[PDB]
Symmetry: D2
Subunit: 245 residues, 4 copies
Amino acid sequence: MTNLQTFLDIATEAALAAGAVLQGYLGVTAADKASEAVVLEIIRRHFPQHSILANEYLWAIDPLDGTTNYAHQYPAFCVSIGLLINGVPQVGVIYDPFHDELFRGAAGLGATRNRRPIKVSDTSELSKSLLVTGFAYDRRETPDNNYAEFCHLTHLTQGVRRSGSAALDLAHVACGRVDGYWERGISPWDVVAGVILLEEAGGKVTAYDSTPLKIATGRILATNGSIHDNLSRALMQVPPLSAWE
Amino acid sequence: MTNLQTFLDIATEAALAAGAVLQGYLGVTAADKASEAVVLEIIRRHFPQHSILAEDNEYLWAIDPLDGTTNYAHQYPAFCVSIGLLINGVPQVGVIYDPFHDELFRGAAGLGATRNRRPIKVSDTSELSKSLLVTGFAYDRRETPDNNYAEFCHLTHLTQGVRRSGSAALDLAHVACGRVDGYWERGISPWDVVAGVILLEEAGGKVTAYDSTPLKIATGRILATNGSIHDNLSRALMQVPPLSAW
Amino acid sequence: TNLQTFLDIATEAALAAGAVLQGYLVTAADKASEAVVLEIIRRHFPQHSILANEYLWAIDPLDGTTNYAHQYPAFCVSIGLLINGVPQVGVIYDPFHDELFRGAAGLGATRNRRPIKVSDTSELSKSLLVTGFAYDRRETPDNNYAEFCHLTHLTQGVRRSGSAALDLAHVACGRVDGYWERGISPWDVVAGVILLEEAGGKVTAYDSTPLKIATGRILATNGSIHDNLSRALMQVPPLSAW
Amino acid sequence: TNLQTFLDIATEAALAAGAVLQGYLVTAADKASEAVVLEIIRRHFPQHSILAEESGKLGNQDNEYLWAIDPLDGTTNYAHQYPAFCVSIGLLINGVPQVGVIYDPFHDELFRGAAGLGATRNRRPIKVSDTSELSKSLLVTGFAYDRRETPDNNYAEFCHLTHLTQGVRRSGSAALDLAHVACGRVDGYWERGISPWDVVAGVILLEEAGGKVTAYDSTPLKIATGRILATNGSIHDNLSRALMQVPPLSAW
């Protein structure tokens, strides 16, 4: 509808403005602060009645996803700007300012990168798939550290990447550069924009066991749709690390 | 040395020409073959007396026409052409070209290291807890218990993170310019690493076996760091607890 | 403020239309770009009026059509806002070189979201200028050739790019020191005029009296050579005198 | 192969010098670019001779191999950061242009050509335009430093062709103008007062791209005269005729 394109227009300009701020600093906490201020000013000026995640309309903003990467100048970081409408992701913009890759999606309006259409891959077999995952800040505090999962899928697939940016990982599923992505311990601002981007690109986003996505649990399974069942089953069957030599 | 700069000039043009071929195909086996043919024609036309290693002369070129083949097949943006020269079995000239991001890494003994013809240098990080590392996993990983998983988990617990890009040559280039602090992998081949090794050394880094004894490429194992973290990372890899201990 | 909101939407319209131009890269391209721009401006500002009333948008969906037809890399989308007939918001986007020029009254001038400023050149000798030639040049003796020859003699050179909007953008970021042209249209210049003024430049008629876009004549400089260039334009020998 | 070896080295010299120009982006930049080009060419081809404006004549100028080097074509543009400047590296074999590389480091456009090996920009083939009518053509020209001292200043030609075509551009770089004919962005180019290092690389590039380069009257090119007519080949006779029939400015 007309509002969603208007929402997507403003989120795009906010992401590009913030991305330029992040690029300027390259010559970390200050950069993240400066990007957030730019994003908030734009969204609040155009949509004073909307809320920022913390009411029908709720913006989930990550001003700098991939903070560890950015501190090391590792080229995998982005701005993520997502809109929840009645708690459902409906508008998403993810901008990688180092590679100048602008991912945009909105419900019923399609998914693009640099304003050209993108689509998920068709891969259905784990043995022919390339996946990506991440590891949470709390990984030393719980036995559920995602290592078992990583090892298991690394054995069953062509490989599991680790980029260091959850938002970019979702964008890479959306354009078919990987076939699937899973992670625990993520935050709403890490994933809201990527979820609608991926769904518009033809993918599927659920919990690990293929029951509906519950962002509050911090767990996400996001695939091209064709590999969703095989990946869900492999994750639920995961042998513990103690079962390896 | 005049000699090394001339070798570096030709390896640079070979990498750029092959990178353009890889870009043309993006619009996998054919791409790899076409890239190799381009590299071989250039090296052998300029240096007909040199020997080629790909797929005991004084001059031996270790060529990877497409490092990151899995990534390339998926269009995952981490692949490159790697062109390294072994002089009496020692890496001395290296060019690594990422044609998707247009990043040209160049180094030669005594001549320095550059990315896009501008100097690069390794990071200063000395503590594992403040470090960002990268590693990979071999094609034989299902057949041996030494699959590198224990190392990956251990280091992921001890550092800020361990990346997995899918290109060993780009991983070495990322150590060389300070985007990661260290890199280790088993099951690699000479053409994966020769260019990156001399690039990293010229950038100020250090490349050895896991236990810090001299690098032995034939074993397929490499530890490549900024030099300041080399000792701590080497000790962490040697003390690695097995997966069964988790 | 209001101007920032206008600038935000003009920027997204220029980038959206520019991507359309890149996809085609002539009549179809120009029309597709215009439809993209018009849809965006009307959806965000249903009460504004269009040029292609307090708010009046002057849109060129493809400035430099001859260049575009030849794939000569000097064409752009130009989106300017007149508020009570005064240029106040301007976006010029070169999609081939991916150069985004943005300006609004009191908000500054940027290229690719970085500040730009006019040059410091103060002497007509040592200056680099640019000009253009109108479609009607064969029907009138005042075809701008005499001016081109005169200024080419008095300066380091007079460029001819083929895009009036980009010429103004080039003055705004200091790549040239001044620009003059006759036979231009409002949609060619509205965005560039405010961009240049925000960058520190000056825009008038040839004789330095206030700009009159309806006359089709513009003199646009870094401000420091403005009087010198204006004097030269007031003292142009006819072609017959060569 | 023989020419391919020359082209490989000229390409690396152009890219290395272009990176120096991008770092600086004037007197030093021009000189720093030349030092990079000369070092590469003389190290790979120590027996070849060099022609350049600043360094002058290096080795016997009747050598079979003579490199015509412009380390920074478009110096006025460069001083103003006007984005139309390049490194031009051409090789004359027995006085004939046979290898050419032109590199615009600001836009990162690498033009390459050699006799029998084809013409490319950024390593993909380029070709001249199909434009056959002067009235439908886009041209480009330039004006020499001596224009105030001679009545033959090219103004009459500029006015005449501006009337007969869709327009005449003025970019400020003769080497890039030749490269623009080579890839079809313009249909033709003419200029007086040019130097060998301005045109040698572009001449072979344009010829390999399918174009044609002569004197104004379509007799063979004589670079020593400083005049060049360079087109897509299809408007060559029409543009030559217009150049032979230029009304003086006084007739306007």
